[PDB]
Amino acid sequence: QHGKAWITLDAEELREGAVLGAVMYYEVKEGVLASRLPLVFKVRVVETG
């Protein structure tokens, strides 16, 4: 449902490398059988300084 995020980063965090891991909570619909499904995320740099 909610598909947009706004992660922002400060000068203390950028000083050591910002690694963005991912945690996923899921439940495959009843009976569906698939192979190599893609999920593609758009990363946009909106503002910087």
Binding site: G31, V32, L33, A34, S35
Partner: protein, 49 residues
């Protein structure tokens, strides 16, 4: 893609062949041999088997 029709099967068979009982008969010939029955006579005859 594939929406599995979730339906598996188990099966079995039962074999009812025979009837419960066998009535083996040895018929009787009651005046028999080495004995005699007369008209109007009275008595007892017995076959054990």
């Amino acid at each position: 893609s594939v929406t599995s029709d979730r339906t598996y099967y188990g099966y079995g068979d039962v074999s009812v062949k025979n009837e419960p009982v066998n009535v083996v008969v040895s018929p009787f010939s009651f005046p028999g041999a080495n004995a005699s029955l007369s008209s109007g006579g009275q008595g007892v005859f017995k076959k054990p088997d």
